[PDB]
Design a protein around this ligand. Sequence first.
Ligand code: HEM
Length: 154
Amino acid sequence: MVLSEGEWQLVLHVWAKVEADVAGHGQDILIRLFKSHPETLEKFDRFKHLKTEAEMKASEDLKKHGVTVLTALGAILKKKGHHEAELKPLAQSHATKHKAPIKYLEFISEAIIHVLHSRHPGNFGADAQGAMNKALELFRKDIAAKYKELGYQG
Ligand code: HEM
């Protein structure tokens, strides 16, 4: 698929606001994922012991991982579709080591959209949400194709 320039501008305009507080957004997104879809927590040996939202919010480790996650995603989005090199090591680790199914990438996608909608209503109207959804769908499609080349699931 291909996004237009005007779609990429909508994506990077809201992402510029996210980047004012990467750690806070990273925490909100992972906590949303883990509360919405508790099954995903089981993939993280590092975090699986966390019982409550309160425990998640107080974890320095979870916050650090949120920063890692959003920094990797932010680098991919700023490539505006030209992200083949950034995607390769990410696909390899998530297919072979972490075993992160496409369905769980859908779930974190939903979590990202929820948090941007909650925190940035003025810059995340319907057209901006549509552009962010397309960017994330593009990401998932390209990662699924690499999963296939690497010998993991769809
Ligand atoms: C926007 C989607 C995601 C991005 C950009 C992302 C990014 C990253 C990065 C950069 C790392 C560290 C380096 C590496 O191991 O590749 C990592 C590790 C990891 N990811 Fe993801 N990830 C995403 C989605 C997921 C999902 C949905 C799952 C599983 C439900 C997952 C499970 C893991 C695990 C288990 C680790 C290792 C954590 C640890 O023990 O240090 N990832 N991810």
